[PDB]
Amino acid sequence: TLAAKVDIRTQPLHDTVGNPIRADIVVTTQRVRRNGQQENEFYETDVKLNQVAMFTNLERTPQAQTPAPWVASVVITDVRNADGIQ
Amino acid sequence: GGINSQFTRSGNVQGGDARASEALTVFTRLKEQAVAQQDLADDFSILRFDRDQHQVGWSSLVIAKQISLNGQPVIAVRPLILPNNSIELPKRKTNIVNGMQTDVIESDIDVGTVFSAQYFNRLSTYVQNTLGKPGAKVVLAGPFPIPADLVLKDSELQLRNLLIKSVNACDDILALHSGERPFTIAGLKGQQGETLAAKVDIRTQPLHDTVGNPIRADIVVTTQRVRRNGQQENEFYETDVKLNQVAMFTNLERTPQAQTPAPWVASVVITDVRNADGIQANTPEMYWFALSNAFRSTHGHAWARPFLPMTGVAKDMKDIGALGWMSALRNRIDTKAANFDDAQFGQLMLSQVQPNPVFQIDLNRMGETAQMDSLQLDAAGGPNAQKAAATIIRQINNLGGGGFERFFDHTTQPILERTGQVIDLGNWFDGDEKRDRRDLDNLAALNAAEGNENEFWGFYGAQLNPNLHPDLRNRQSRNYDRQYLGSTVTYTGKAERCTYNAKFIEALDRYLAEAGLQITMDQRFMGNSVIGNNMVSGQAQVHSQYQTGPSSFY
Amino acid sequence: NQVAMFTNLERTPQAQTPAPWVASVVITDVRNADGIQANTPEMYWFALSNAFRSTHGHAWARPFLPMTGVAKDMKDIGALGWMSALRNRIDTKAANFDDAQFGQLMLSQVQPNPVFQIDLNRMGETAQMDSLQL
Amino acid sequence: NWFDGDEKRDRRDLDNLAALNAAEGNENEFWGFYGAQLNPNLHPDLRNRQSRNYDRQYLGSTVTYTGKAERCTYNAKFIEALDRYLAEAGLQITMD
Amino acid sequence: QRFMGNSVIGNNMVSGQAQVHSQYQTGPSSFY
């Protein structure tokens, strides 16, 4: 089965040339192949496919002063595949 | 997986471990250099245990030396784990329940859990297949991981010392399996009119491991040979007169009594036990002889010496005045004052500290003395409880003649006790130099949190609460260290704390003392401490209704 | 079987680490089940043996804890603080007060072990055993 | 037995804690009440008189005496010996 | 003479408690 794991980060991600990229929320997709008597304890075979880096930002609607004043907008910065996949 | 084989784009990316080949090359060059300088002998081999083609958590380096005993080959191995920071092992998930809600806890995996029975079985099979002997017997000599965040390009001396020590350990285990003369104190007389002296020492800078790992050490007890004759020659020159060294530090524990006995009890923790640098041999009977020096620290209450304030500086991390926060007066006792001195320091220690200490040891299954720490952990409790105790008793009997039964009875007396406490091993870089993570103790936490008792009590419960799950305790301990110490903490391993039996230490000391071992070494009135021994118990002897009713029984 | 018990506090004569007060448990009534119509001497000791079992989890101190909602003020345990180090009484029936420091109070002012006593009566239902014990 | 406002109750409800609650801060009166119970020097009739006066003072006017009883203390070792003998004799009782 | 308390109740005290029915991971060892 395919499982998706969410993650919250505080250190920025890095590009292939060392360029930092802001990333607060990281969503990944993995392959879970846990059978009954699974062998290879503590050893994993590259079970990971995708990775998306996201961070949220707040925008204020122009209403003078029940709806909330602020609206949360999520910005997608980087989309990439697994390192193993060429 | 199959995706790469399904598209097959030209070029290769990743798929390799680069912290094993370089280490192997470095070790081969170091071995060649050592052999060239007539430091070792070309009789051992160095092999690589790749994780990729063996499917294991961590790659390792193994140093195998083989001999022949009665026609049966014997191989001794000293694996060296090689953790890498470029890859992440999958974490371990645990579930706990609180009321109507269930949550998932993500733990972390240490080096110790990687080295399991299956790992050693695969390593032994690989070594047997590589060396050409399928049925050869394989005996472990003690694993020793190489810590991460260590640059191998400029650490040649530590690696060289580690290799020589590994060869020495392999020789030691091979000699023990072959069978040699046990080390006894009867051969330490020297028949030359010398005596053994023990010197106590108080330190402030941490001790260092063979790979630069800091170790906290406040009290150091050593044993030396004093050979000062009449017209002694060689002035200012000394010939390696030193045998043992034990590093100790004290910690305070509070008994649960509501508010004449002192509120706090002092517990002494033994961190490192080692022999002299000159001595290249390590045998089981030397370990107990070195450990016997720990009890000698109570000759003049030397365990309380580090507690007294130093003049001129105040790090405010080990201040003893914080002990007064929970005393009868809410505020703290103010040291660093003109009036304060040793005159009432003794009064404070008498009125708030128990006179007798407690002895504890921080056993580590992955340290330098792993082969004895594992044995003591097994003797503490488990399926192998009788065998370990019998082996320990046999070793103690072998050291110093025999007849240990007159002082101890292992049949109906526990040797070591497990307190159910797990201690992290790490280092935090102070402003001046790298220090040890174990510097944070009960007194340090009390100093950090001036008056808020609830936070300190939460921290104290985060260590030894039996009701709370161990993973939560580890999480709280890792959060508190970050809160207090700093952002430079780097964990390296795990350790367990155990408490020795009170009678066992005294019996061992008395047995060694009676076995011909003689060790020599080194104010305002307060009242009469001897008048209370003589007290009359009795009282002077001088000559100077119950209505009933009918009973069916009689 | 069924045994009815209630605890009472006695004060040892010590002038001012041992707790000032000692708890004494008084056994009032010992009886068998309603269905059983037989009364023999060997059942009395079997029933009385149940009295010692009340100390399995310090169950003798359970009635002392305050009840929520009502306060008859006749069995209040806060009066024990009148002769304590502080002159005033400890104020129960408060938001902060709970079992967290109730155990602390019992440890610091009540002896851990109880005392067993019996109120023998030569004219009660079990007169033939009360007279023998007297 | 003394008739409470709601229903008839038992006279033994008045104990050391009840007397301490009734007398808030006057320690001397409570000490006199405590001595009225187990003073060996004072005669038993005076102790009964004081105990009958204190009950009237605290409980109420509905007290109605019915009999007499005596208090005794079991031996500490006897209870433990009896419990151990019954336990070793094949009796197994389980609870929380 | 004024009463001060019961000096004999403390001699009789129950010492015991009511008697009712109601990990350890290891590693390789060279010794055994």
Author numbering:
A (entry chain M): 242 to 306, 319 to 339
B (entry chain D): 48 to 306, 319 to 581, 590 to 611, 622 to 631
C (entry chain A): 291 to 306, 319 to 436
D (entry chain A): 486 to 581
E (entry chain G): 590 to 611, 622 to 631
What's the publication's text?
Size-exclusion chromatography coupled to multi-angle light scattering (SEC–MALS) of purified chimallin indicated a mixture of oligomeric states including monomers, well-defined assemblies of approximately 1.2 MDa, and larger heterogeneous species ranging from 4 to 13 MDa (mean of 6.9 MDa). Cryo-ET of the largest species revealed pleomorphic, closed compartments with near-identical morphology to the phage nuclear shell that we observe in situ. Analysis of the smaller, more defined assemblies by cryo-ET revealed a near-homogeneous population of cubic assemblies with a diameter of around 22 nm, and a minor population of rectangular assemblies with dimensions of approximately 22 × 33.5 nm. Two-dimensional class averages revealed that each cubic particle consists of six chimallin tetramers (24 protomers, 1.67 MDa) arranged to form a minimal closed compartment with apparent octahedral (O, 432) symmetry. Three-dimensional reconstruction of the cubic particles with enforced O symmetry resulted in an approximately 4.4 Å-resolution density map with distorted features, probably arising from the inherent plasticity of these assemblies breaking symmetry. Using the maps for the tetrameric face and full cubic assembly, we built models for the higher-order chimallin oligomers to understand the subunit interconnectivity. CTS1 extends from one protomer to a neighbouring protomer positioned anticlockwise around the three-fold symmetry axis of the cube, and CTS2 further extends anticlockwise to the third subunit around the same axis. Although the linkers between the C-terminal domain and CTS1 (residues 582–589) and between CTS1 and CTS2 (residues 612–621) are unresolved in our maps, we could confidently infer the path of each protomer’s C terminus within the cubic assembly. Compared with the tightly packed chimallin tetramers mediated by the well-ordered NTS region, the length and flexibility of the linkers between the chimallin C-terminal domain, CTS1 and CTS2 suggest that flexible inter-tetramer packing enables chimallin to assemble into structures ranging from a flat sheet to the observed cubic assembly.
